[model samples]
Target: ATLKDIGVSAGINILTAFIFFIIFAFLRLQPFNDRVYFSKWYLRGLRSSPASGGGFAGRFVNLELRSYLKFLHWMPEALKMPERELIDHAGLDSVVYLRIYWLGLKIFAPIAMLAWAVLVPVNFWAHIIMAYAFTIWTCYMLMKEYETVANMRLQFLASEGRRPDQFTVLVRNVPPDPDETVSELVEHFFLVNHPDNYLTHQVVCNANKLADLVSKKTKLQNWLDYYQLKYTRNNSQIRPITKLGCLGLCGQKVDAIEHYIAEVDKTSKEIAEERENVVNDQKSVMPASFVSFKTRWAAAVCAQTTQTRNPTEWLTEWAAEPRDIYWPNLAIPYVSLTVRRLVMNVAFFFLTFFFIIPIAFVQSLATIEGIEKQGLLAGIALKLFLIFLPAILMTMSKFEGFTSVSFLERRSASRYYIFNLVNVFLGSVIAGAAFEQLNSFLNQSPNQIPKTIGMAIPMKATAFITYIMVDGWAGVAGEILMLKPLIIYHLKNAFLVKTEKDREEAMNPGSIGFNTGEPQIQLYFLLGLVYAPVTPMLLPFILVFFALAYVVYRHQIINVYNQEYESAAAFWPDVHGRVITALIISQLLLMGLLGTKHAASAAPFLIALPVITIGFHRFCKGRFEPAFVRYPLQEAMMKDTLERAREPNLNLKGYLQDAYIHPV
Candidate 1:
């Protein structure tokens, strides 16, 4: 497409985003839409104080028409929440997440300005020099970010006082004792080995059956409620009826309210019995436990150091927050977990490299010639499906059972980065099907591949420029509108809600979708670095993505996004590593592009960029990654000492005894 075509596309997308924003702004002020828009703050009790306290209409809608005039008021309101308060209100996860966007702006805006001043007016030589300059500057900024995030994590942990996870270690693969029960073995082992520090232990139980029964009882109770409400609302109406069997069909007819009450009672009894069975049955107990320590120092030391001579038998690590643990994975054997990891790694490799095979196959099946012959609307539907390709990939990634949400996000980020690099990053430049590009890359020599892709860069600069406006600018604006969630919420509230709690559940303001959001933002960073030296004009488009994303996401975390789990910025290292990856990719592309321009003298100098970048990443991993992964003994000791001084008679054992027990 030409520059004018790109402009028209960008304008259309931006206009669409603006329209969405206007609609959202209008709807959010109404009382009916209040639960949909500001659910997070409302759920947190932060927005309980009345914002509209006047007349009846005022309760729902802003009666003052002037309130609608400030269309951009939310921008400042989003920024108005101080970072400290944001950390408290939202979470370290949300606050750290917003910083990723801010980091993009901080890193790119200045680089873009420098590139415009120096590289735009110059030849290959100047481009090469400024390219190295930009890479070094990027490294410096990344180091600063890494250090800042590390300190933030440590401070957050230090000031957090005494969390349950802080004084506990999750021990897995406990060696089974044939003569003794699992719970008895755990208690006896910990008491004997670490008697001074051992406080209490909760043996993990296989409560899947109990949990299912509890869920069944809850559903039966909800049905009982609905039927009773229906009877109260319209007594003259014939009483609702149901059958005795599954789904209330093909069995004896019964009054729905009475049937549900009987079913609920039965399920409740079953649930109670199952819970007792889980506790008493030795076979239902898993060979794992949450072992508590008398002090944080003891827990930290045990977490970092080995427990038994045989490391695999009594494997231990710092326990994740009760809310953060993916309990299902805790039961997997050590050998099986290793095998799963290896299998997943191989599968991910093929998924990344050969994903184009499926894309090509799908494209062939979705040809316009085939769909158009049926109907124009059919063809349009096909086009929309293609537009939703990224969402499809995102769904697939989430379906892959990852042990932790943090791990899931990192895997997703890696997968998405590869997807964009192949399809959007390289596909935009190279005019061919994805499989064709893959074939071409395979046919070329290792040294020739970069040159081939790099040479196509400048020619497609305009396409990427337009993409920024459409995907970044307009897409982020669409995010604030939350079109999908809005529709889903209304549908649920209308059909599914039977009580205030039901309405609240329907109004769930989901957590930051880091799996999708983080990778897309990283793609913009990749685009910025790729085009910075090649096409200076592309820089502003990138700058726009970062700037808009920062504001948009800041508003999202403050008002909309609910943090599902907290990892204390555990994903920062992933962000840092990915940025370094992008830098290396950009540097290599520059090297190839310059080589094509006959700038052989600059080759060796440009080679240093990737090496230095990788080395810097390694240094960062050693320095800051530990802060996210393990607690330091010194910090733990300090906290423990202070806590003991403050609360001399604190009953830590009592506090932790039930903390790790099965929910059922």
Candidate 2:
């Protein structure tokens, strides 16, 4: 029993290792980090090389190679000038990697084709189903790549701490006297790059309001602080301890701490309460008219736009900042720090491995479908409760900030880590279901049965389900649950260039430009490809899903753009919606083409080929246009902001020449 257990354990260990290796490898090749971290280089709208993703010419090398090989095959083909030129032009430069990619595709395509051939049988039905599934999945991935690029850019900004820039009222805790609200206290944020004072540039509407009401001052600093404010009337109040100069540490200039205490003492108690004034880090109360405390807190968190420190200086001091490590709300408990992770991690591996292998081995030997189903349900249920749950618990104890699952604990809750656990779980469940279904589908015979089943159903039962989910859940859950983290992470890390005001912005569709963090499109293809050879049957389902998915994606994209810029919603949605509809239409047309692929009594293959060509042309064009429009590199943006923020003057344009700045 022990020897058998050891062998089984070793195999499971290998499987687990392989799984992790695959994940890491995929991440390495993924566009998430690159877009999040690198695309910012393109934001000043840096023109990436046409060959940036290994050049256009490099990508189609195989087609060139094939054409050249064809020319060589003919009796006089070897002497053909055009063919020779074409193949020769496929040089080993930026495009050299294309050869590798093409070669991999070649290996991949055939294996994919062979998988369809082996299980489905190379008949009309097999060709129809397999070709449709494979091509649809591939095209979807290609189309999705552009969006992926944008997301990664967002993620990078979040991770890099490069949030947006905006101005807000900054008051030193001075005397509570009404007369003390002076012009000098409100300084203008000058555009250091402008030939003259950028902050002083005044425009039409209520230009008079730009001046400080108490002490007439027209400047950029006042532009943000003055016009929007309406202070309470009358009595100067007694300064309570809560209304002291420094808010213990409400993002103050440490030297001016004493001055603020003086103002509160002069003000009445009611006036102090009205202002929500605080001293020595006590809570400040802003009246409901301005904003509620809860609302401010929510805004500070959700928008992830607030920064209590200097934008440029924060990067250098981030690690040293007490808030970064010991924020009373975000810190992991001391017990968590003392606990070791590796041992717990290893224990997790053994536990899951042993539990799964024996069950799987026994299932493989069993012939009864009912028994297998029952065993699977039991196994999953048990694992969820025992092995998986315990592992999660142990990890939770040691995890810090966003990754832990403690309710009362600050690390997981305040740090916004609960979602990370959700991601892990969702990703795992999806992967498991996908692989399992793939194996089941590909292992079956495509030629033998139910050629009629597909057409037998009036319309696929799942299509209706897909439409509802994509249009609904895709926007709500996908944006909030899946996408918000990406935006927040990018704000923190990639865009190291964000302002306190920027952190206050909400994670809505329109305010999307800042975060470029996202997963890769290629992984979607890889996943599809992985599932393809095994679960060819799911190919149709995948195709249908993609068709619906395109619409959902387009909606989000267009909605975000519209919200952000207040663009004519009509044009973008039409453009986006039309393109996606065409892709889905093409998919449906492809299905029809496949339907007609009767090797025996079918219409001409060339006739059907036109549908493929047209569909592909449109799909490629639609998918690639967004890539051209914007790459959304969060890191580069952050880097640019950070570099500029470092300068004492905070020159927004000088630092972020590539960034698009809207007028105040």
Candidate 3:
């Protein structure tokens, strides 16, 4: 794409996003629309207002016309709340998520300025030096970011006081013995090995059937409630009735209230039976349990240390919060889990590069004289289509049965990284899609792939520069508008809402969606690094993205989004790793680009950047990742000691016994 084409694309997207922000700004002031726009603050009881405020239509629509003129008022309003207050209002997850955007601004703005101000006027060798210097600078920023998040997480755990997970460890893949059942085995093992610290355990049950029954019972009960309400409202004369079958399609006609009541009673008895079976029947019990410790220190040891010589069985980890467990994965055995991961890995590989096979054929056919034709409409559509690719990857991550939001995001980040590495980074260089790049790379020897792509790098500098403006600059602006959520909320509110509670339900201030959000930012990091030496003009676009993203996301977390779970920023390690990955890719690409320039002597030095970047990652991982993933016994002991001193008669046994019960 040319500069004119890129300008048109950026303008179109930014204008659309701006119009969306304007619509949201005006609509949010009206009483009826408040829930849809600012549901998180409202749900947290941090915001509210009277139902009516003066003029005839004032309750539903803002009477103050002047409010419409100041479309950007919310920018200041969003920034008005202090960070401490925002943390208190929105929770730590939301606050830390905002930090991601801030992190970008911190890392990129200075680097961009340095690249433009210094590197652009330098020699070819200086360009090579700039690349190495930027790589080292990024590693430092990443290590610092990792340490900051690690300390933040540790403090968040310590200061937030005692919680269930602090004193518990999740044990899965218990060894099966003929005489002892899963529950008995768990109890005996803990009592024998950790007698001083072991307090209690809750064995996981295969509760899929029970959960479905309970859901059916709740819906039936809701219908009964509606009918009872109707009868009371109609002077005790009206009654609701239905056929007793699937969707009331075919069965005996029955009194709806009476039938539902009977069904609920019958289901309740079945639920009791199922609960008994879950507790007593060995068949229903999974080889997994949540084992509680007498103190957080003990829990830390059990969670962080191995339980058995066989690493596959008797596996232990810090327990996720009761609400955070995926449950579906609990029933999976170690063997099955391994097979599944292998399958997913292979599937992902094909999913990443399979398109290259067919697209290569198309490109080859087009190579014939007079066959090639550049279609502007096709290019525009491709750009628009690329916008939804991240959303699709995010949806796939959600369905992957990851037990925590943190893990889901990390999985997504990995997938997104691979996708962009091939399609965006490599594909952009070779002037083709991922499939074409892969096909060409595969048909050539391993040694020739980088050289071929490297040769094309300088030729495609303008295209990548345009991509920076469209993908990074316009994309970040689009986020502040929240066009998707706004449209979705209005649809739900119009159709799904029936009461004040229903309105709240319809008001969906979704979680940070880190899976989608973080990967996109990482792409910018990759682009910034890739283009730093090759095209310093791209740095300003990257800088704009980071700055705009920081402000927009700060506004979002404060006024718009709600986090579904708090992993205390456990996703930070993945963020750290991805940036390092980007650094290495940039370094390698620099090496390739320079090699194509016949700078053979500098290739060895450029190669050292990736190796050093990787080594720095390992050092940071060992130094800081543990703080995010595992609780140190020393720190846990301190907290445990302080807690006992504060509450000498604490009933920890009672507090922990039922803490890990299945939600169903």
Candidate 4:
């Protein structure tokens, strides 16, 4: 009934975030372990070390007192790098991604202060006033951020280095011809359509067939190398032997390293066979092809214009960058993918509901699948569910046939966006069953949104505090401690890095997980903004998490995160929409909350909050969304003209020849 344990002392909960803060600052110091923490710089073009080397006990331990003294400088370091430098160093996508943190900081700092002043007296009328006040301020910040980001993304593309995608168009649904091959069909269509501007074409293969083999082999081969790393230790080696089944220790024993190598080779043999089969067989080739043009301006025209009257066949659009292609979904046609995703949209809506704490008589997919096994399970699994549910959702998303990795992430990221609105924000505010709670379920009652808010508005301070500490601060800070890489770095260095061949391998770093990172931040932002007027006290915790997370991610993009494809902050419009989406939902909740007060019955004119919010969303859709979604002929022509003068005899054909090859 009450959260006395958490309510009694907030310090007990805050200790976790603070502990991580102290550890992260200390862990980043070891020169030997620099690669683990700062591997972004090492992964640049596959250089060895680029800075320093180490030992397990002797060198892994940090000794430099000067380095420890500058522990406070990470704050200065993150802010010190100018935004301009970050754009150039990381990419606009990263700069704008972190600007979300900046956006939260700047937007809320004022609202937090205002919420404190007006909400110190939550006279109900003040909430409506705060409601309207926040509406104007949120719109102002978003409109300004939206306009600047949209401009930045457009400019980033225009001034970017000469790229293949600029002159490439992805043509899908090529109408099959009785007279010609897929290759010949594309050439004839492009030759006749654009005639003079047409360049060579690379046909997309139905590589989905090989995708299973390739990803499978890569995983088994990864274990093969790891087994080698595990076997040879400190210049003395006996082979690593293990049972063949169940965690490598239950069935018939075998030499683990040798078995792995044999399996790895076998997969590669099959992969080569599959690769040859896919390339040679005409049926394996999709009707879709990546078509390049002589000029960027022409590429834009082809991508922007209608190729056929029916529009079902010869579908054309701008191609993603060479690496941007996901390469698996090449086989699907327009109708196949279009309908697969239509259901997948509502599929997850059901997925987010009833997918927790099932106690059904008969087993159901989500009712049981998404729920708890026991109390201990509920704690650990729910904790992991927050962090790891993306794996499950992405698999579902992968079935939809998105052509680019970015869309796959953004789609799953959005699904996970609402995922937390149900799990974190709704659940603790209205706890269910027991330690592993059961939330709204078993019925599709029409008024679920209003139902939860009116009941949930009445508060308990400590529960939300503990939530912010555990989910917001500690986990956010835990990322920078780099535990996974630390163990990996030490383990590999001990057994593997001593060898000369292993020594040459560069640090394997990763890009910002847009799916994971964006979903999490939006949830935090949603929780803070939703509670700002109702409970002003929560703002400081929100602000603290934002500040800590802002610095943490800023350092990460610079030193730890790598860029996969320069998306040019195309994610901004989506970001802008979701913010407004969160705001409108918050406004709706405001009306429900205010309506409950007798004097404020039905909430006079609170209707305008969402009305104006939608108006803002609409205005933004026309004003800036065009530049991201469509390429302009004038801008394309301008870049084309400038580049022609700069490099008249560029070897354009060779670039396109190697551009769209399958990675396998």
TM-score of each: 0.85, 0.25, 0.83, 0.87
Comparing 2 with 3 on lDDT, the higher-scoring candidate is 3
Model 1 bad stretches (over 4 Å): 1-3, 49-69, 216-277, 349-402, 426-459, 500-504
Tens-digit per-residue lDDT, 1-664, candidate 2: 2435434543554344334333323322334322322222323234242123522332223322333322223213212333223222221111211121232243345445555666656424444444445545444544453344334333433333332212111111222235322122111211222214222211111111111221222221222221122232322222223334312335433222222333323333433443333222222211100010111122122123322354421111011111111222122322343343444445444433333454555556554555544244455433344323433543443442222112212221211122221222112333243245335446766742234323322232233223223322232224322334446645533323234433322222332221111111122223334344334443332342333233322222322222222111111212223223333433444445445644644335424534664576466556544432232334334444555556446543332222211111
Candidate 3 Cα misplacement greater than 4 A, ranges: 1-13, 49-69, 119-123, 213-280, 355-401, 428-462, 465-474, 483-504, 597-601
Tens digits of lDDT, candidate 1, 1-664 = 7768877877787777677677667666656556667777776876642233211344324632455444467778888989999998888888888898888888888888888888656636777777887888888899998998888888888888578889999888888888987778888888888888999988877787887888778766654454456545432222333433235334444545633466778888898888788777788778888999999998888799887889888888888777766555655566776676666667656665555556556666667456564343354433454456445555444445444556666666677777677657764546455446668778876767655755664446776787788779888988887777777767655533576543336567688878778888888888888777777878887887887788888988888788888788988988898889889988888877787667568878888878999998999999888898889999999999889998999999998888887665
**Candidate 3 C-alpha lDDT tens digits along 1-664:** 6668766866776675566666665565566666656667666776663123311244334544565445677667777888778766777777777777677767777677778777666636777878877877777788777887788788888876668888998898998899998889999999998999999999988886787778777665654454445444432222333534335324444544533467789988888888787666779788889999999999988987888998888988889877677666666665766666666677667656564544455545546633554532343333543565556565555555565556766787788788877667665446566556657767875678766766665335556666666666666656665667767766644533335543336466687678777777887787777777666776776777777677777777776788777788888888788788778777877776677666667988887888898899899989999888888878898899899999998888888889887787
RMSD of 3: 6.8
For candidate 2, the lDDT comes to 0.31
RMSD of each: 5.1, 25.3, 6.8, 4.8
Question: Where in model 2 is the C-alpha error above 4 Å?
Answer: 1-118, 122-530, 560-664
Q: Show pairs that collide, candidate 3.
A: 356-435
- CA lDDT, every prediction? 0.75, 0.31, 0.71, 0.74
Task: Return the TM-score for candidate 4, rounded to 2 decimals.
Answer: 0.87
TM-score, candidate 1, is 0.85
Decreasing TM-score order of the candidates: 4, 1, 3, 2
Best by TM-score, which number? 4
